[PDB]
Design a protein around this ligand. Structure first.
Ligand SMILES: [Mg+2]
Ligand SMILES: [Mg+2]
Ligand SMILES: [Mg+2]
Ligand SMILES: [Mg+2]
Ligand SMILES: [Mg+2]
Ligand SMILES: [Mg+2]
Ligand SMILES: [Mg+2]
Ligand SMILES: [Mg+2]
Ligand SMILES: [Mg+2]
Ligand SMILES: [Mg+2]
Ligand SMILES: [Mg+2]
Ligand SMILES: [Mg+2]
Ligand SMILES: [Mg+2]
Ligand SMILES: [Mg+2]
Ligand SMILES: [Mg+2]
Ligand SMILES: [Mg+2]
Ligand SMILES: [Mg+2]
Ligand SMILES: [Mg+2]
Ligand SMILES: [Mg+2]
Ligand SMILES: [Mg+2]
Ligand SMILES: [Mg+2]
Length: 48
RNA sequence: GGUUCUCCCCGAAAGCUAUUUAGGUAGCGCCUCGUGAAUUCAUCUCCGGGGGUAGAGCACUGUUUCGGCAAGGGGGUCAUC
């Protein structure tokens, strides 16, 4: 064991979602929000 | 209005209900991922059902033409208590 020979367990290091970074990533442009609503706006949504 | 690298798998809706609601939103229908479960599901053959649409008809509710019979009407001549 050395400082450059340790690795984590498989399945514990899921990567986060990054929106709006091109066509190929699957989340570009609208970034998962759809088209033209109150829910698509910055800060938008209704109270509980 | 705009939203920046790549490949693989699956894949919609533009409907119902409510709303100072109608180009917004919420529950349900429709997509995706995970888990569990029954011959659970679809096509065809045979069997058991209810029906009142298409068509037709004129006993009923309405409407329509011709012939017969004729109550009952309208117009009169004569008589008039
Ligand atoms: Mg996409
Ligand atoms: Mg989303
Ligand atoms: Mg836009
Ligand atoms: Mg729209
Ligand atoms: Mg909208
Ligand atoms: Mg929306
Ligand atoms: Mg947007
Ligand atoms: Mg905004
Ligand atoms: Mg703001
Ligand atoms: Mg744009
Ligand atoms: Mg496909
Ligand atoms: Mg459609
Ligand atoms: Mg709009
Ligand atoms: Mg609005
Ligand atoms: Mg869907
Ligand atoms: Mg499934
Ligand atoms: Mg079967
Ligand atoms: Mg029958
Ligand atoms: Mg008929
Ligand atoms: Mg009849
Ligand atoms: Mg007759």
């Amino acid at each position: 064991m050395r400082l450059n020979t340790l690795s984590p367990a498989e399945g514990s290091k899921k990567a986060g979602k990054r929106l709006g970074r091109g066509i190929g990533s699957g989340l570009g442009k609208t970034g998962g929000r759809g088209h033209k609503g109150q829910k698509s706006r910055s800060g938008g949504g209704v109270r509980r």
